[PDB]
Scaffold this motif. Structure first.
Motif, PDB file in Angstrom:
ATOM      1  N   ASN A 110       0.739  -1.212   0.000  1.00  0.00           N
ATOM      2  CA  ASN A 110       0.000   0.000   0.000  1.00  0.00           C
ATOM      3  C   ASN A 110       0.795   1.303   0.000  1.00  0.00           C
ATOM      4  O   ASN A 110       1.968   1.370   0.462  1.00  0.00           O
ATOM      5  N   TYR A 111       0.200   2.321  -0.547  1.00  0.00           N
ATOM      6  CA  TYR A 111       0.912   3.508  -0.808  1.00  0.00           C
ATOM      7  C   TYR A 111       1.589   4.068   0.431  1.00  0.00           C
ATOM      8  O   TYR A 111       2.660   4.561   0.359  1.00  0.00           O
ATOM      9  N   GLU A 112       0.928   4.001   1.562  1.00  0.00           N
ATOM     10  CA  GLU A 112       1.537   4.578   2.736  1.00  0.00           C
ATOM     11  C   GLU A 112       2.795   3.870   3.157  1.00  0.00           C
ATOM     12  O   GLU A 112       3.795   4.476   3.431  1.00  0.00           O
ATOM     13  N   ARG A 113       2.719   2.576   3.169  1.00  0.00           N
ATOM     14  CA  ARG A 113       3.943   1.774   3.458  1.00  0.00           C
ATOM     15  C   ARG A 113       5.076   1.994   2.430  1.00  0.00           C
ATOM     16  O   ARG A 113       6.286   2.079   2.753  1.00  0.00           O
ATOM     17  N   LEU A 114       4.701   2.072   1.150  1.00  0.00           N
ATOM     18  CA  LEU A 114       5.752   2.178   0.135  1.00  0.00           C
ATOM     19  C   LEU A 114       6.411   3.556   0.277  1.00  0.00           C
ATOM     20  O   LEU A 114       7.632   3.615   0.047  1.00  0.00           O
ATOM     21  N   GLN A 115       5.631   4.617   0.510  1.00  0.00           N
ATOM     22  CA  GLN A 115       6.146   5.999   0.684  1.00  0.00           C
ATOM     23  C   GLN A 115       7.084   6.030   1.889  1.00  0.00           C
ATOM     24  O   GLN A 115       8.139   6.650   1.829  1.00  0.00           O
ATOM     25  N   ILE A 116       6.752   5.265   2.919  1.00  0.00           N
ATOM     26  CA  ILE A 116       7.621   5.241   4.148  1.00  0.00           C
ATOM     27  C   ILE A 116       8.972   4.614   3.756  1.00  0.00           C
ATOM     28  O   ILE A 116      10.043   5.153   4.034  1.00  0.00           O
ATOM     29  N   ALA A 117       8.907   3.478   3.059  1.00  0.00           N
ATOM     30  CA  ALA A 117      10.111   2.758   2.609  1.00  0.00           C
ATOM     31  C   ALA A 117      10.950   3.579   1.663  1.00  0.00           C
ATOM     32  O   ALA A 117      12.199   3.550   1.737  1.00  0.00           O
TER      33      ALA A 117
END
Ligand SMILES: CCCCCCCCCCC[C@@H](O)CC(=O)N[C@H]1[C@@H](OP(=O)(O)O)O[C@H](CO)[C@@H](O)[C@@H]1OC(=O)C[C@H](O)CCCCCCCCCCC
Ligand SMILES: *[C@@H]1O[C@H](CO)[C@@H](O[C@@H]2O[C@H](CO)[C@@H](O)[C@H](O)[C@H]2NC(C)=O)[C@H](O)[C@H]1NC(C)=O
Length: 246
Positions: A110-117
């Motif tokens: 999900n976008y939020e996790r990928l943006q964090i990574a």
């Protein structure tokens, strides 16, 4: 399977790939003339293989769940890679089984996790065809932090463009020059589930949304979508997430 080659690519050949991708997703019904994605598909049929080739001809195969256009993982030479989520571990039961090793990425899709990574929100990551050439290149050899930003480019330039004609046109405008997504693009991405649901609920509500969806428009202005006569519904959205999956 569907394919796209960045070598020689142009707005026309990208449009042909986006058309092929939409036409690969099965549906039994249209709702307001928009294909309604299936509630469920069993076995290996759930997954579509997208073969993507970078400008140098090197390739990854991306597995997409045909019910929701979510990317589950990809194959790059002899190695498979999957999101750290149950739907992706499930997919790894059916696709790329012939890979020499399987790596589970250290995030979900999900976008939020990928943006964090990735260390950056989508708003700050340029997208376009050159960006997709780069993402394919990055995914060819494991680097989890580089891969998160590559995957944000890949998701937007394949799945998101398949879901919204506006997003496909934004990528076409970026065939030879990347640019961060427009605020309307980010808005549509974020609203796809909402919209899919409201369009389906309109069927027994005279075309009227049970709950209005707020979007940002092409001019950067903040419109409110209330019914199926909206351009977002008549012209833009191309696939509907089944409400069984919402
Ligand atoms: C032991 C522990 C067990 C496991 C680990 C966890 C389980 C985690 C499951 C995550 C599944 C995820 O892959 C599915 C998903 O969501 N995908 C994004 C997108 O799919 P793609 O491949 O990106 O198409 O499909 C959507 C199409 O646009 C997109 O939105 C999705 O990403 C997100 O939803 C991420 C954030 O929720 C959204 C980030 C924006 C933040 C602003 C709010 C959005 C506005 C909502 C309207 C009010
Ligand atoms: C259905 O959708 C359209 C929006 O596309 C609405 O028509 C608009 O009405 C508002 C009223 O505030 C105006 O500001 C817009 O200029 C109108 N646009 C167009 C293209 O007609 C309409 O209000 C909605 N209908 C229902 C029954 O909710």
């Amino acid at each position: 399977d569907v394919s796209f080659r960045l070598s020689g690519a142009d707005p026309s050949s990208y449009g042909m790939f986006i058309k092929d991708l939409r036409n690969a997703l099965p549906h039994t019904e249209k709702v307001y003339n928009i294909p309604l994605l299936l509630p469920s598909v069993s076995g290996a049929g759930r997954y579509l293989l997208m073969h993507l080739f970078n400008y140098d001809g090197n390739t990854i195969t991306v597995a997409v769940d045909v019910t929701n256009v979510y990317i589950m993982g990809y194959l790059a030479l002899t190695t498979s890679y999957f999101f750290n989520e149950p739907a992706a571990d499930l997919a790894s039961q059916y696709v790329f089984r012939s890979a020499r090793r399987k790596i589970t990425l250290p995030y979900s899709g999900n976008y939020e996790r990928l943006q964090i990574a990735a260390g950056k929100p989508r708003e700050k990551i340029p997208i376009g065809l050159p960006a997709l050439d780069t993402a394919i290149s990055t995914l060819l050899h494991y680097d989890s932090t580089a891969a998160a930003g590559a995957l944000l480019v890949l998701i937007q330039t394949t799945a998101e463009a398949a879901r919204f004609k506006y997003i496909e046109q934004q990528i076409q405008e970026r065939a030879y020059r990347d640019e961060v997504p427009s605020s309307a693009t980010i808005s549509l991405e974020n609203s796809w589930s909402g919209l899919s649901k409201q369009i389906q609920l309109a069927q027994g509500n005279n075309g009227v949304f049970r709950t209005p969806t707020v979007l940002v428009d092409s001019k950067g202005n903040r419109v409110q979508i209330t019914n199926v006569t909206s351009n977002v519904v008549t012209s833009n959205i191309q696939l509907l997430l089944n409400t069984k999956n919402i």
